[PDB]
Chains A and B, each alone.
Chain A
Amino acid sequence: ALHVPKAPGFAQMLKEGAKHFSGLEEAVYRNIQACKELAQTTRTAYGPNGMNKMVINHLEKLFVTNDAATILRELEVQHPAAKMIVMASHMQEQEVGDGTNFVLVFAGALLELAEELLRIGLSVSEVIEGYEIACRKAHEILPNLVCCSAKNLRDIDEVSSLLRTSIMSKQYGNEVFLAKLIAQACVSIFPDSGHFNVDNIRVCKILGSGISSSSVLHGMVFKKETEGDVTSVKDAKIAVYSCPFDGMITETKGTVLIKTAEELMNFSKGEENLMDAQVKAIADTGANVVVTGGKVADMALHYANKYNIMLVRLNSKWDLRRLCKTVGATALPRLTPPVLEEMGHCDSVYLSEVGDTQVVVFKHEKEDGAISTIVLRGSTDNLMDDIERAVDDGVNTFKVLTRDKRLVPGGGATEIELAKQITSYGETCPGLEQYAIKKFAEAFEAIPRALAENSGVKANEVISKLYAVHQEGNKNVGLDIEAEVPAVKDMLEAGILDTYLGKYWAIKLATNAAVTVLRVDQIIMAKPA
Chain B
Amino acid sequence: AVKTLNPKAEVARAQAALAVNISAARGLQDVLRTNLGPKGTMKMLVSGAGDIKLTKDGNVLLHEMQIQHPTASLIAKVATAQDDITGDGTTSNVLIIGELLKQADLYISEGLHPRIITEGFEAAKEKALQFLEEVKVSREMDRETLIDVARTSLRTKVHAELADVLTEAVVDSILAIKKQDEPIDLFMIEIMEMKHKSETDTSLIRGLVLDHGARHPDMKKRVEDAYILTCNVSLEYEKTEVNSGFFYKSAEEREKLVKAERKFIEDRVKKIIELKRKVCGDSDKGFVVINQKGIDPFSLDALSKEGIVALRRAKRRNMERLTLACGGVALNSFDDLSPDCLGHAGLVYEYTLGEEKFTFIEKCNNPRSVTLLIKGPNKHTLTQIKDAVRDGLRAVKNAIDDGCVVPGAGAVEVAMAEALIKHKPSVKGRAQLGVQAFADALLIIPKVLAQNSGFDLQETLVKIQAEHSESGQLVGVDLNTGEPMVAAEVGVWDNYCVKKQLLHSCTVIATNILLVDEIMRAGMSFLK
Q: Which residues of A contact B (CB under 8 A)?
A: 8-10, 12-15, 18, 78, 80, 83-84, 87-88, 91, 94-95, 242, 247-258, 263, 266-267, 270-271, 274, 321, 324, 330, 333-334, 508-509, 512, 516, 519-529
B28 contacts A255, C-beta separation under 8 Å: no
Closest A residue by C-beta to B198:
A508
Instruction: Known contacts A91-B377, A252-B239, A252-B244; decide if A266 and B297 are in contact (CB<8 Å).
Output: no
Across-interface contacts of A83 in B (CB, < 8 A): 50, 52
B254 contacts A521, C-beta separation under 8 Å: no
Across-interface contacts of B52 in A (CB, < 8 A): 80, 83-84
Most buried by A among B27, B65, B218, B251: B251
Q: Within the complex, what minimum Cβ distance (angstroms) separates A444 from chain B?
A: 22
B257 at the interface (CB under 8 A from A): yes
If A251-B261, A254-B245, A523-B44 are given as contacts, then 6 extra A-B residue pairs at C-beta distance below 8 Å, sorted by A number, are A9-B26, A91-B378, A248-B258, A252-B244, A256-B249, A522-B34
B130 at the interface (CB under 8 A from A): no
Across-interface contacts of A256 in B (CB, < 8 A): 247-249
A39 to B42, CA, bound (A): 25
B255 contacts A248, C-beta separation under 8 Å: yes
Closest B residue by C-beta to A273:
B251
Across-interface contacts of A78 in B (CB, < 8 A): 50
A521 contacts B34, C-beta separation under 8 Å: yes
A378 to B161, CA, bound (A): 53
B257 contacts A254, C-beta separation under 8 Å: yes
Across-interface contacts of A522 in B (CB, < 8 A): 31, 34, 41, 43-44
Instruction: Known contacts A91-B377, A263-B249; decide if A250 and B46 are in contact (CB<8 Å).
Output: no
Across-interface contacts of B41 in A (CB, < 8 A): 519-522
A109 to B245, CA, bound (A): 73
Closest A residue by C-beta to B68:
A15
A526 to B47, CA, bound (A): 5
Contact bitstring B283-319, A, C-beta under 8 A = 1, else 0: 0000000000000011001000000000000000000
Instruction: Known contacts A519-B41, A524-B66; decide if A250 and B217 are in contact (CB<8 Å).
Output: no
Across-interface contacts of A80 in B (CB, < 8 A): 44, 46, 52
A471 to B81, CA, bound (A): 65
B246 contacts A250, C-beta separation under 8 Å: yes
Across-interface contacts of B297 in A (CB, < 8 A): 242, 333
A321 to B252, CA, bound (A): 33
Across-interface contacts of A247 in B (CB, < 8 A): 251, 254
Q: List 26 A-B contacts (CB under 8 A).
A: A9-B26, A13-B72, A80-B44, A83-B50, A87-B378, A94-B354, A248-B254, A249-B254, A249-B258, A250-B258, A250-B261, A252-B246, A253-B245, A253-B246, A254-B245, A255-B245, A255-B246, A255-B248, A257-B249, A333-B297, A512-B377, A520-B41, A522-B41, A524-B45, A526-B48, A528-B48
Across-interface contacts of B254 in A (CB, < 8 A): 247-250, 254
A519 contacts B42, C-beta separation under 8 Å: yes
Q: Within the complex, what minimum Cβ distance (angstroms) separates B91 from chain A?
A: 15
Tally of contact residues, B, Cβ under 8 A: 55
A12 contacts B27, C-beta separation under 8 Å: yes
Tell me which of A9, A257, A512 contacts B247 (CB under 8 A).
A257
B272 at the interface (CB under 8 A from A): no
Shortest Cβ-Cβ A-B pairs, 4 listed:
A254-B246, A521-B41, A9-B27, A15-B66
Across-interface contacts of A242 in B (CB, < 8 A): 297
A18 contacts B66, C-beta separation under 8 Å: yes
A352 to B378, CA, bound (A): 48
Across-interface contacts of A18 in B (CB, < 8 A): 66
A161 to B92, CA, bound (A): 63
Across-interface contacts of A8 in B (CB, < 8 A): 23, 27
B44 contacts A87, C-beta separation under 8 Å: no
B251 contacts A516, C-beta separation under 8 Å: no
B64 at the interface (CB under 8 A from A): yes
A87 to B258, CA, bound (A): 53
What does DSSP make chain A's interface, helix, strand, loop or mixed?
mixed
B63 at the interface (CB under 8 A from A): no
B249 contacts A527, C-beta separation under 8 Å: no
Across-interface contacts of A330 in B (CB, < 8 A): 218
* Interface residues in B27-80 (C-beta closer than 8 Å to A): 27-28, 30-31, 34, 41-50, 52, 54, 64-69, 72
B24 at the interface (CB under 8 A from A): yes
B237 at the interface (CB under 8 A from A): yes
Across-interface contacts of B248 in A (CB, < 8 A): 254-257
Across-interface contacts of A13 in B (CB, < 8 A): 24, 27, 67-69, 72
Across-interface contacts of B257 in A (CB, < 8 A): 250, 254
Across-interface contacts of A257 in B (CB, < 8 A): 247-249
Tell me which of A94, A263, A521 contacts B42 (CB under 8 A).
A521
A18 to B68, CA, bound (A): 12
Q: Within the complex, what minimum Cβ distance (angstroms) separates A338 from chain B?
A: 13
A242 to B257, CA, bound (A): 21
Q: Within the complex, what minimum Cβ distance (angstroms) separates B155 from chain A?
A: 15
* Interface residues in B196-235 (C-beta closer than 8 Å to A): 196-198, 217-218
Across-interface contacts of A88 in B (CB, < 8 A): 377-378
Across-interface contacts of B245 in A (CB, < 8 A): 252-255
Tell me which of B23, B217, B378 contacts A84 (CB under 8 A).
B378
B127 at the interface (CB under 8 A from A): no
Instruction: Known contacts A9-B23, A516-B54, A526-B48; decide if A266 and B250 are in contact (CB<8 Å).
Output: yes
Across-interface contacts of A14 in B (CB, < 8 A): 66-67
B250 contacts A527, C-beta separation under 8 Å: no
B252 contacts A270, C-beta separation under 8 Å: yes
B500 at the interface (CB under 8 A from A): no
Q: Within the complex, what minimum Cβ distance (angstroms) separates B315 from chain A?
A: 27
Across-interface contacts of B430 in A (CB, < 8 A): none
Across-interface contacts of B43 in A (CB, < 8 A): 520-524
Q: Within the complex, what minimum Cβ distance (angstroms) separates B443 from chain A?
A: 22
A263 contacts B250, C-beta separation under 8 Å: yes
Q: Within the complex, what minimum Cβ distance (angstroms) separates B244 from chain A?
A: 7
A527 to B196, CA, bound (A): 32
Across-interface contacts of A527 in B (CB, < 8 A): 48, 66
A196 to B122, CA, bound (A): 73
Closest A residue by C-beta to B31:
A10
B390 at the interface (CB under 8 A from A): no
Closest B residue by C-beta to A248:
B258
Q: Within the complex, what minimum Cβ distance (angstroms) separates B220 from chain A?
A: 16
A87 to B377, CA, bound (A): 9
Across-interface contacts of B66 in A (CB, < 8 A): 14-15, 18, 524, 526-527
B379 at the interface (CB under 8 A from A): yes
Across-interface contacts of A15 in B (CB, < 8 A): 66-68
B42 contacts A270, C-beta separation under 8 Å: no
Across-interface contacts of A526 in B (CB, < 8 A): 46-48, 66
Across-interface contacts of A321 in B (CB, < 8 A): 217
Across-interface contacts of B251 in A (CB, < 8 A): 247, 267, 270-271, 274
A526 to B46, CA, bound (A): 6
Q: Within the complex, what minimum Cβ distance (angstroms) separates A7 from chain B?
A: 10
* Interface residues in B122-145 (C-beta closer than 8 Å to A): none
A529 to B47, CA, bound (A): 9
A407 to B360, CA, bound (A): 34
Instruction: Known contacts A91-B377, A94-B354, A526-B48; decide if A251 and B237 are in contact (CB<8 Å).
Output: yes
B42 contacts A520, C-beta separation under 8 Å: yes
Instruction: Known contacts A10-B30, A256-B248, A267-B251; decide if A520 and B65 are in contact (CB<8 Å).
Output: no
A508 to B24, CA, bound (A): 44
* Interface residues in B234-278 (C-beta closer than 8 Å to A): 237, 239, 244-252, 254-255, 257-258, 261
Across-interface contacts of A94 in B (CB, < 8 A): 196, 354
Across-interface contacts of A255 in B (CB, < 8 A): 245-248
B27 contacts A267, C-beta separation under 8 Å: no
Across-interface contacts of A271 in B (CB, < 8 A): 251
Across-interface contacts of A251 in B (CB, < 8 A): 237, 261
Instruction: Known contacts A9-B23, A10-B31; decide if A523 and B46 are in contact (CB<8 Å).
Output: yes
* Interface residues in B369-384 (C-beta closer than 8 Å to A): 377-379
Most buried by B among A9, A84, A529: A9
B44 contacts A10, C-beta separation under 8 Å: no
Most buried by A among B43, B255, B354: B43
